[PDB]
């Protein structure tokens, strides 16, 4: 049993700043004979497979930028990123290979950027869905920051909480924003009883709700 | 070029069995140890097993989490790596990666998993396989469109736009499970001068049901 732990679990840093993350093993990973620490770092960006960054604790894989530096020895190791770039958003794992292989729990690196208001789009149910008796109403909330946001659905002016399913994207690797999708699912029967459908977004970038709506007679 | 391709993932009932494969090329297979690593949705990587190279007699090792339950093997004539999985449980639901491991007999030896496949997804569940319904999202300078991929099981589905030719300005939202069915959506933002004058189509695949859909987004 070699236990691996990492710190912090997550953090956020502005582009251009320094990032420091830590890795500990429950026993030394140092082969004193060969003077090698059996400790590697892997980078996993959203929806991608892990990628080898560092091995033997401090050797950069070919093609890895020099802003990434691994250090430490024995039981304590550090991955440092000087001048973080937007594209560096990812989970970083450390892994011992002194005794079989064990990964740490990972450190989630996110990027701080200026606040940005969400761009809100609403979409009525498709006729192809309606034909089968369902009615889903969709609102996209794109390219906002910070991640904290609330969406309220209203039907004929009254809030509807049941039947809503929300999903957030991982941070955008280009512009460091977030996006969210909110889908309200009704039956066709219920959908046809009302006229006005509205999604209201609450975000720190606006004192008033950010609202999109439609009526069933357009 | 080093290539690793996993296959064989899918839906399997609790207590059932499944065998994953990993096709390799671009290197001398028998010179290398090979590992399997898994990752449940939203969780950390977990190393599972390796099999050593020819020099070491192709011996195997396992994490305690799977030893006695999973069997790693290789076929050196067709350069495949396999993982036989038995008595599967919900905790075994995850994406499984094969990764090229070490060759300590090499002058260029270093200790790491240097190449990884795209991964193959496994879901351990008694729920039935259900194909997605795919619905267009069209509005009632720039214009945002989308596709709603609703009511499928199991994960995953893939979504592209215009066969991958539209990639920037695309957001595909992580699937959400509700009542044993997944739903996800994808938005795409393009110049208004290009839609609907140019065609915008979402391409959706659901491997578990062999579903392939093309849904053209039309004004309406
Ligand atoms: C004389 C060479 C020692 O290492 C090798 C070799 O170069 O042929 C490889 C070595 O590899 C593996 C293995 O289990 O196959 C995988 C590799 O990634 C590492 O995990 C190493 C371990 O670090 C080896 O640790 C041990 C060992 O089990 O041999 C035990 C440790 O407690 C310590 O004693 C080290 C020792 O400090 C090494 O000098 O050895 O393992 C492995 O295949 C060994 C082989 O066991 C040697 O008989 O050969
Ligand atoms: Mg009502
Ligand atoms: Mg965007
Ligand atoms: Zn052994």
* A27 CB within 6 A, ligand 1: no
Residue B20 and residue B85 in contact, taking contact as beta carbons nearer than 8 Å: yes
CA distances in angstroms from A139 to A210, B173, B187, listed in the order given: 12, 12, 10
A56 ligand 1 Cβ < 6 A: no
- Triad B139, B140, B142: Cα angle to 5°: 30
Paired tokens of A31: 């082969």
Chain A residue closest in CA terms to B133: A129
Nearest Cα residue to atom 28 of ligand 1:
A99
Tokens of B206: 């659901």
Write out the DSSP string of B51-94. E--GGGTT-EEE-TTTTTTEEEEEETTTTEEEEEE-S--GGG-E
Give the number of C-alpha atoms closer than 13 A to the C-alpha of residue B135, restricted to the C-beta side. Answer: 29
Q: How many CA atoms lie within 13 A of B126 on its CB side?
A: 2
Instruction: Provide the terminal-to-terminal Cα distance of chain A, rounded to the nearest Å.
Output: 65
Neighbour-count burial for B135-162, b at 16+ CB within 10 Å, e otherwise:
bbbbbeeebbbbbbbbbbbbbbbebbbb
Whether the CB of B104 sits within 6 Å of ligand 1:
yes
Q: How far apart are CA A68 and CA A77, in angstroms?
A: 13
How far apart, in whole angstroms, are the C-alpha atoms of residue B112 and residue B211?
A: 37
CA B143 to ligand 3 center in whole angstroms: 12
- Flag whether residue B180 sits within 8 Å of chain A, measured between CB atoms: no
Token pair of B186 as six digits:
């994808």
Q: Which CATH number is associated with domain A1-113?
A: 2.60.40.10
Compute the distance between CA of residue A162 and CA of residue A155 in angstroms, rounded to an integer: 12
**Domain locations along chain A:** 1-113, 114-216
Q: Closest approach of chain A CAs to the CA of B136, in angstroms?
A: 6
Q: Are B143 and B219 in contact (CB under 8 A)?
A: no
Nearest C-alpha to atom 5 of ligand 1 is from which residue?
A: B104
Q: What is the DSSP letter of B195?
A: T
A17: number of Cβ within 10 Å: 13
A145 touches chain B (CB under 8 A): no
* A1-113 and A114-216: identical CATH topology: yes
CA of A187 to the centre of ligand 2 (A): 11
Instruction: Answer whether A136 sits within 8 Å of B118, measured CB to CB.
Output: no
CA nearest to A65, candidates A53, A56, A73, A57? A53
Residues from chain A contacting residue B111 (CB–CB below 8 Å) = 36, 38, 40, 55-56, 97
> Would you say how long chain B is, in residues?
220
**Resolution value in angstroms:** 1.9
Please list the helix, strand and coil fractions of chain A in percent, rounded to the nearest 5, in that order.
Answer: 5, 50, 45
Q: Dihedral of CA A185/A188/A189/A192: which sign? A: positive
- CATH class in words for B1-126: mainly beta
Chain A contact for B9, CB < 8 A?
A: no
Q: Quick one: CATH architecture of A114-216?
A: Sandwich (2.60)
8 Å CB contact of B47 and A100: yes
Contact call for A138 and B146, based on CB within 8 A: yes
Residue of chain B with shortest Cα separation from A5: B44
Instruction: Please give the Cα distance from B20 to B94 (Å, whole number).
Output: 12
Nearest CA to ligand 1 atom 18: A97
Give backbone dihedrals phi and psi of A211, rounded to 5 degrees, phi first.
-120, 135
- Angle, CA A81 vertex, CA A176 and CA A85 arms, to 5°: 25
- Please answer whether residues B167 and B188 qualify as being in contact, where contact means their C-beta atoms are separated by less than 8 angstroms: no
Q: Which region, left, alpha or beta, applies to residue B208 given φ > 0 means left and ψ of -120 to 50 means alpha?
A: alpha
The CATH topology of domain B127-219 is Immunoglobulin-like (2.60.40)
- Indicate whether residue A98 lines ligand 1 (CB < 6 A): yes
Q: Which-ligand-closest: CA of B52?
A: 1
The terminus-to-terminus CA distance of chain B in angstroms comes to: 47
Residues of chain B with CATH 2.60.40.10: 1-126, 127-219
How many of the other CB atoms lie within 10 Å of CB of B64? 8
């Amino acid at each position: 049993d070699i236990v691996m732990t990492q710190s912090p679990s997550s953090l956020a840093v502005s582009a251009g700043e320094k990032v420091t993350m830590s890795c500990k093993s429950s026993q030394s990973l140092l082969n004193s004979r060969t003077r090698k620490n059996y400790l590697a770092w892997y980078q996993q960006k959203p929806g991608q497979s892990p990628k080898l960054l560092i091995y033997w604790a401090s050797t950069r894989e070919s093609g890895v930028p020099d802003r990434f530096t691994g250090s430490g020895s024995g039981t304590d190791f550090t991955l440092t990123i000087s001048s973080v770039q937007a594209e560096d958003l990812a989970v970083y794992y450390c892994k011992q290979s002194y005794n079989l292989r064990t990964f740490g729990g990972g450190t989630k690196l996110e990027l701080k950027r200026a606040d940005a208001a969400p761009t809100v789009s609403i979409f009525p149910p498709s006729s192809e869905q309606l034909t089968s008796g369902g009615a889903s109403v969709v609102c996209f909330l794109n390219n906002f920051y910070p991640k904290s946001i609330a969406v309220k659905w209203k039907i004929d002016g009254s809030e509807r909480q049941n039947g809503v399913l929300n999903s957030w994207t991982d941070q955008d690797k280009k512009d460091s924003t977030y996006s969210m999708s909110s889908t309200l699912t009704l039956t066709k029967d219920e959908y046809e009883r009302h006229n006005s459908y509205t999604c209201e977004a609450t975000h720190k970038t606006s004192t008033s709700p950010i609202v999109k709506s439609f009526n069933r007679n357009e | 070029e080093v290539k690793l391709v996993e296959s064989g993932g899918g839906l399997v009932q609790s207590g059932g069995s499944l065998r994953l494969s990993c096709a390799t090329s671009g290197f001398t297979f028998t010179d290398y140890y090979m590992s399997w690593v898994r990752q449940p949705p939203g969780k950390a990587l977990e190393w599972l097993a390796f099999i050593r190279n020819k020099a070491k007699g192709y011996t195997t090792e396992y994490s305690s989490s799977v030893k006695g339950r999973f069997t790693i093997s290789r076929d050196n004539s067709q350069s495949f790596l396999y993982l036989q999985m038995n008595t599967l449980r919900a905790e075994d639901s995850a994406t499984y990666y094969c990764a090229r491991d070490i060759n300590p007999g090499s002058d260029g030896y270093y200790d790491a998993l240097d190449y990884w496949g795209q991964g193959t997804s496994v879901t351990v569940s008694r729920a039935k396989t259900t194909p997605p319904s795919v619905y267009p999202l069209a509005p009632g300078s720039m214009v945002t469109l989308g596709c709603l991929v609703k009511g499928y099981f199991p994960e995953p589905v893939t979504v592209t736009w215009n066969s991958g030719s539209l990639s920037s300005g695309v957001h595909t939202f992580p699937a959400v499970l509700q009542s044993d069915l997944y739903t996800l959506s994808s938005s795409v933002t393009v110049p208004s001068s290009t839609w609907p004058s140019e065609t915008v189509t979402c391409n959706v695949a659901h491997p578990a049901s062999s579903t392939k859909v093309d849904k053209k987004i039309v004004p309406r």
